[PDB]
Design a protein around this nucleic acid. Structure first.
Lengths: 1340, 58
RNA sequence: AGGUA
């Protein structure tokens, strides 16, 4: 039992015990990259697959082949911390073993000579962090997993557009993993067409002609032969009694010598059964029935070889007479039924203009490339490379398995390139679907959509890099020497590394990690994107993909997605879902034996799920997996229904498996509207970390899992006893049974403190443990941002009352007590970044100095002698941080300026001020200063000081580690020395460093003493080499981009408090803006006198359907009542027994609760620890759909000595008169979103204009004005608003002359305008004239 | 072809001899990158050329 | 690119 749990036990409701612990929430990314990077002894995902696919590379003449052996990952030159500090990527060098082999020159193959290049460096690949992220430019980036149509065959239905004919059609698309798409589509004329990619359709038989198939061969492979024996008169035919279905009697149906069905009759099942039981062999048929038939193959004369019949023509009297007289006896016709295989292939062959492979190749080559005279070799090469080139066309394992699955083959593996048999099978399946025998497949079923995680995308991009470097290598093998030359000189690392960096850094699916919550990071790493390269563009809607499909159940969270124009495209992966081996989504299900529901699990994929019937997680089971309902609700084929308890095959593992972490963290989700729950889940990711991040009273139980699994929490890798606690360091003495052989020593955890996140929010870790605390693996040593006691603590729990209050909470607004700002809660810390670059201009190199010409001495005060502000100095907007100056160029002076300089005796300064000022509107303390001067450029004093600081920090860390290790070494040295003759009297009084100067007689003890002396020397060398290695990193400068001499980074920490205008919300989706912070007295207060911290508009509940917030408020009353009672007991300090009894009763209170009770804790210390942790309230865990009921909430409220109805009458603050009827009060978890009003102001009257236009916009310090778009112009035109419109258009927007004249007039105190002409219109005129078009302005 | 790449491919004009110097710098950078295996250090770039190093960065 | 209405 975790000691972290011992410190605070969250009361968990829920009547159905979970049998499957929550999976490691980041398993997707970690497993993806492990598959990408780990060695494979066989062809498997990752670098190995790409290398074995592209290697060996064969030379274009020369017999000089490059063969692959293996790859090795070099250890990164910089760790994560220094990578973030220095702004460089966290990457590992890639080194590959290769061999150049030269065969017999020139003769059949066989090696003559071979040379080996070992560990050749062909680029650096970003290495994955332990948090599941990558560091690329000092910013921690995340690669979102992509949901894309799986390689294979999709038999889609074409509907809604019918070529003005109706009769919706079918089309089969072969989507390769890499290569060209293939399409087999139908037309309303019942003809089949082939499209390579999306070019012009060709008749479908052309591909078969190119595949070297005769017309008779095609007809045999597709249609069924019908045997016609030339006997009696005008032939008889061999009739299968099963063949005649849905046909009319146009021919006498004879059997046993007599006709059973006469011509003109309707053939039913009775006649069919009679014929089958009578076993009709052959029947005589009239020639009229024959005249509509089609001959399958060719027929020549049997005595003179004259052609009289060929493949695929209709039959007629003359042809029948010719074939009868020629000497034939057997005629093979085509079976053509309008319900069975129809006249599709026959008519397609009729449309076919080609009859041979060569013409098919010509047609393919001309449709793929317009014109382009069809050279036979070129056409053959194009056709072969389109579908049969392993380096140009590939399906991969997933594609092959889907290909065989849709064609119903027991094979699940095979060659990536297509074969003729596969194409023919695809045609047969599509034709059967056209006949109605087959069924279409959704392109939205999760079985047809595969997830490319980080590893697969990286491997594909690395394969592209290998392809381009393969082109380079193949060019070089013939351009370069055809004999011995070292292969490292012919491999180019620039393209592969550059492309890999392009993928990881600048891509649609490589995003800055949304880093303001542990939940935000978890959601971003679990995000599933339908966009990106190879996915879906935003040109969609396209409702199908955006809509939630029934297969998403338990695989993708249905209620978490952005509300922008990408809704239903950016999903979040469910809590329990994991990627299948083939990349599909599989979810765990408890295997259900007919009678007993077993505890064993099976991860069912999407397609496998439909076969079985799956029971809902709400099913009530007593004892060992026995249902209490004979008919239980389940889902089998995507439709929910009641099934008897003896046919169920699987059950949901947990009630929370149908949502993601963000959705799962919302309490009483079962009581909320899906729209508003979606809004709440989306906003929960935007919570800003809070300085006092305590806990949510009403949790869901995923708080601990989310906090632990995210990287923001320092978790003890190996258990033991806490040896040292510090705000920056935590040192753990590992347990005896957990240390490696020899001296493994201590485990040190450096706590990340006050570091800029990607949202300019502070992320620091505070130690939540103390000295001597026993910790074990998986314990929370340090609580990260928005995390306390190992629980996820985004927002804060606050007392809220649902009532209108003088209209200040009017739309969705929140009213907030002054106690909130007084308690300094919801007060966030924003660490923003400022960069001042001293560059090298052609006017002269810029420099950083304290002395700035023509500036106030206050600016000089805050800087050192190096021109850099002191760390910890308080600065405001406009203050100078870095004393940059730029060599001033030539100066032009107006006559008045010349007169003034002549008068005052002053002259132009040779250097202009370019110092970095604080942008106006922000304040705060300079907490950190970074100085980056490139190697080869002289260092300044401040950089030397910073390097010395970090050097001594590393030195202190190393010295602490070394002194602990050497203290252990000296202790064991004394232990050895005391043995073999008592030498403990003098040794005990001697310094531990003088303990190796005592000799001993020749023995095992003496040899051990010598070995330990050698170990001491080795430890000294280890310390020296470690210090040297880290000093090399510290001392060396950062190789910056050319042009910048130095970079000065300054961190500003703004303690930004909550104020009116800030956006604040709840978990359930209730939103709003804080209207006014009233004084504490004005708050309505209860009878006891506690004023309510927050007042919410109650009218927002019954229309937003989110009653769950009311239940959360009531449960908050219950929790805080238990907390108040336990706090009163603690102040009264009754005894251990009373507090233990009360806590036990509180945990017991419920119904079929799986909480588990005490005593299993310590008698006194743990009881008081729990009491101190709960005095602020007992946290309650409400599972997502196994949550607490109203009866349980009311019982818990009764335990808290609180009104059962959850409503207390409140006395107004202004009038001191109680409101009529009670009002709902309670402790609700409220969130401060990252939409602070301080960031939302921008205002300008003068500033950034533009180059091409004069529209005012630009600047991250002062932005442009507000876009007065066409909507607002219409709004003004609607009124008689003319002069205001003209101001919007000319004076303040684009008329530079008018703008200056207006500014001068307003300063002078005059209000009138020059209409002028906006510069935008002059730009328009000049640009129209730039074409061959005249445009002018004409007077009357 | 080299003249065309020098003139009509660069948005800003770069002299042909300067283009050849750039190509030599890039080739030597690739050589040093694949030899050292880490990165092209400006010191070695200066050593290989007769060119000081500030001219190299410009 | 992500997020807000």
């Amino acid at each position: 039992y975790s000691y972290t749990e011992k410190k605070r036990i969250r009361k968990d409701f829920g009547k159905r015990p979970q049998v499957l612990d929550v999976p490691y929430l980041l398993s997707i990314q970690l497993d993806s990259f492990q598959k990408f990077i780990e060695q494979d002894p066989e062809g498997q995902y990752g670098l190995e697959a790409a290398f074995r696919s592209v290697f060996p590379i064969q030379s274009y003449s020369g017999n000089s082949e490059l063969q692959y052996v293996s790859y090795r990952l070099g250890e990164p030159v910089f760790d994560v911390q220094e990578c973030q500090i220095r702004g460089v990527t966290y990457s590992a060098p890639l080194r590959v073993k290769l061999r150049l082999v030269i065969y017999e020159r020139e003769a059949p193959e066989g090696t003559v000579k071979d040379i080996k290049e070992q560990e050749v460096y062909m680029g650096e690949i970003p290495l994955m962090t332990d948090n599941g992220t990558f560091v690329i430019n000092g910013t921690e980036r995340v690669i979102v997993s992509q949901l894309h149509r799986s390689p294979g065959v999709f038999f889609d239905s074409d509907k809604g557009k019918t070529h003005s004919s109706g009769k919706v059609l079918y089309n089969a698309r072969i989507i390769p993993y890499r290569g060209s798409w293939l399409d087999f589509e139908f037309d309303p004329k019942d003809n089949l067409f082939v499209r390579i990619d999306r070019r012009r359709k060709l008749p479908a038989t052309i591909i078969l002609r190119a595949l070297n198939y005769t017309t008779e061969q095609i007809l045999d492979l597709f249609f069924e032969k019908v045997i016609f024996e030339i006997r009696d008169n005008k032939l008889q035919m061999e009739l299968v009694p099963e063949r005649l279905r849905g046909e009319t009697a146009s021919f006498d149906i004879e059997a046993n010598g007599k006709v059973y069905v006469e011509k003109g009759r309707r053939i039913t099942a009775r006649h069919i059964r009679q014929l089958e039981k009578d076993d009709v062999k052959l029947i005589e048929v009239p020639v009229e029935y024959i005249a509509g038939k089609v001959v399958a193959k060719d027929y020549i004369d049997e005595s003179t070889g004259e052609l009289i019949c060929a493949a695929n023509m209709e039959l007629s009297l003359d042809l029948l007479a010719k074939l009868s007289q020629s000497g034939h006896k057997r005629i093979e016709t085509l079976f053509t039924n309008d319900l069975d295989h129809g006249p599709y292939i026959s008519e397609t062959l009729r449309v076919d203009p080609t009859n041979d492979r060569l013409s098919a190749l010509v047609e393919i080559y001309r449709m793929m490339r317009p014109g382009e005279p069809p050279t036979r070799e070129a056409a053959e090469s194009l056709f072969e490379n389109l579908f049969f080139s392993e380096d140009r066309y590939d399906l991969s394992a997933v594609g092959r398995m889907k290909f065989n699955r849709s064609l119903l083959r027991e094979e699940i593996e095979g060659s990536g390139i297509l074969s003729k048999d596969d194409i023919i099978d695809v045609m047969k399946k599509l034709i059967d679907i056209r006949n109605g025998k087959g069924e279409v497949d959704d392109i939205d079923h999760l079985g047809n959509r595969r997830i490319r995680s980080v590893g697969e995308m990286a491997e594909n991009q690395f394969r592209v890099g290998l392809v381009r470097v393969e082109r380079a290598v193949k060019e070089r093998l013939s351009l370069g020497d055809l004999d011995t030359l070292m292969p490292q000189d012919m491999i180019n690392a620039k393209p592969i590394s550059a492309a890999v960096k392009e993928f990881f850094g600048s891509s649609q699916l490589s995003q800055f990690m949304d880093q303001n919550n542990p939940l935000s990071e978890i959601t971003h790493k679990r995000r599933i994107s339908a966009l990106g390269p190879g996915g879906l563009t935003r040109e969609r809607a396209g409702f199908e993909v955006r809509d939630v499909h029934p297969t998403h159940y338990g695989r993708v969270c249905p209620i978490e997605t952005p509300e922008g124009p990408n809704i239903g495209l950016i999903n979040s992966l469910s809590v329990y879902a994991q990627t299948n081996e083939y990349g599909f989504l599989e979810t765990p299900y408890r295997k259900v034996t007919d009678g007993v529901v077993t505890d064993e699990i099976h991860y069912l994929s999407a397609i496998e799920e439909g076969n079985y019937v799956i029971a809902q997680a709400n099913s009530n089971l007593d004892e060992e997996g026995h249902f209490v309902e004979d008919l239980v609700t389940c889902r089998s084929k995507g439709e929910s229904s009641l099934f008897s308890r003896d046919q169920v095959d699987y059950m949901d593992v947990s009630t929370q498996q149908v949502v993601s972490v963000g959705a799962s963290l919302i309490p009483f989700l079962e009581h909320d509207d899906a729209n508003r729950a979606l809004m709440g889940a989306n906003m929960q990711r935007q919570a800003v970390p809070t300085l006092r991040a305590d806990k949510p009273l009403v949790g869901t139980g995923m708080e601990r899992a989310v906090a632990v699994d995210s990287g923001v929490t320092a978790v003890a890798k190996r258990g033991g006893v806490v040896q040292y606690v510090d705000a920056s360091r935590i040192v753990i003495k590992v347990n005896e049974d957990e240390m490696y052989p020899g001296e493994a020593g201590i485990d040190i955890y450096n706590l990340t403190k006050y570091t800029r996140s990607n949202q300019n929010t502070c992320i620091n870790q505070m130690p939540c443990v103390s000295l001597g605390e026993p910790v074990e693996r998986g314990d929370v040593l340090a609580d990260g941002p928005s995390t306390d006691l190992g629980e996820l603590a985004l927002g804060q729990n606050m007392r809220v009352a649902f009532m209108p209050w003088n209209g200040y909470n009017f739309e969705d607004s929140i009213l907030v007590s002054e106690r909130v700002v007084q308690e300094d809660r919801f007060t966030t810390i924003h660490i923003q970044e400022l960069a001042c670059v001293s560059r090298d201009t052609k006017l002269g190199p810029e420099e950083i100095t304290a002395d700035i010409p023509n500036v106030g001495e206050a600016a000089l005060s805050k800087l050192d002698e190096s021109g850099i502000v002191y760390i910890g100095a308080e600065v405001t907007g406009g203050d100078i941080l870095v004393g940059k100056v730029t060599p001033k160029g030539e100066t032009q002076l107006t006559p008045e300026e010349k007169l003034l300089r002549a008068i005052f005796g002053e002259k132009a300064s040779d250097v202009k001020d370019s110092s970095l000022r604080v942008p106006n509107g922000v304040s705060g303390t300079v907490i950190d200063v970074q100085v980056f001067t490139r190697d080869g450029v002289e260092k300044d004093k401040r950089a030397l000081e910073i390097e010395e600081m970090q050097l001594k920090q590393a030195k202190k860390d190393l010295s602490e580690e070394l002194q602990i290790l050497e203290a252990g070494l000296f202790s064991r040295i004394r232990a050895v020395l005391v043995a073999g003759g008592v030498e403990a009297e003098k040794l005990d009084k001697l310094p531990r460093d003088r303990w190796l100067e005592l000799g001993l007689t020749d023995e095992e003890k003496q040899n051990q003493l010598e070995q330990l002396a050698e170990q001491y020397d080795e430890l000294k060398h280890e310390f020296e080499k470690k210090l040297e290695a880290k000093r090399r990193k510290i001392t060396q400068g950062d190789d910056l981009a050319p042009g910048v001499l130095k970079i000065v980074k300054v961190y500003l920490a703004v303690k930004r408090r909550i104020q009116p205008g800030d956006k604040m919300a709840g978990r359930h989706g209730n939103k709003g803006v804080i209207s006014k912070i009233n004084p504490i007295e004005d708050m309505p207060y209860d009878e006891n006198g506690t004023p309510v911290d927050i007042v919410l508009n109650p009218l927002g509940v019954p229309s937003r359907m989110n009653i769950g917030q009311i239940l959360e408020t009531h449960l908050g009353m219950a929790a805080k009542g238990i907390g108040d009672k336990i706090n009163a007991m603690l102040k009264q300090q009754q005894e251990v027994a009373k507090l233990r009894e009360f806590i036990q009763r509180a945990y017991d209170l419920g119904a079929d609760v799986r909480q588990k009770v005490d005593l299993s804790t310590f008698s006194d210390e743990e009881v008081m620890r729990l009491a101190e942790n709960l005095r602020k309230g007992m946290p309650i865990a409400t599972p997502v759909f196994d949550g607490a009921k109203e009866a349980e909430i009311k019982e818990l409220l009764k335990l808290g000595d609180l009104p059962t109805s959850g409503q207390i009458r409140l006395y107004d603050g202004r009038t001191g008169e109680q409101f009529e009827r009670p009002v709902t009060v309670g402790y609700m978890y409220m969130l401060k979103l990252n939409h602070l009003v301080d960031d939302k102001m921008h205002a300008r009257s003068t500033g950034s204009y533009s180059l091409v236009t004069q529209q005012p916009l630009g600047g991250k310090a002062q932005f442009g004005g507000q876009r007065f778009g066409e909507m607002e112009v219409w709004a003004l035109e609607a009124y008689g608003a003319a002069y205001t419109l003209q101001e919007m258009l000319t004076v303040k927007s684009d008329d530079v002359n008018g703008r200056t004249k207006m500014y001068k007039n307003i300063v002078d105190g005059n209000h009138q305008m020059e209409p002028g002409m906006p510069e935008s219109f002059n730009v328009l005129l000049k640009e129209i004239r730039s074409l061959g078009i005249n445009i002018e302005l004409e007077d009357e | 072809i080299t003249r065309s790449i020098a003139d009509q491919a660069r948005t800003i004009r770069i002299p042909v001899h300067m283009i050849e110097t750039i190509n030599k710098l890039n080739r030597i950078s690739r050589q040093m990158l694949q030899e050292m295996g880490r990165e092209p250090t400006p010191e070695e770039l200066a050593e290989r050329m007769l060119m000081p190093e500030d001219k190299i960065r410009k």
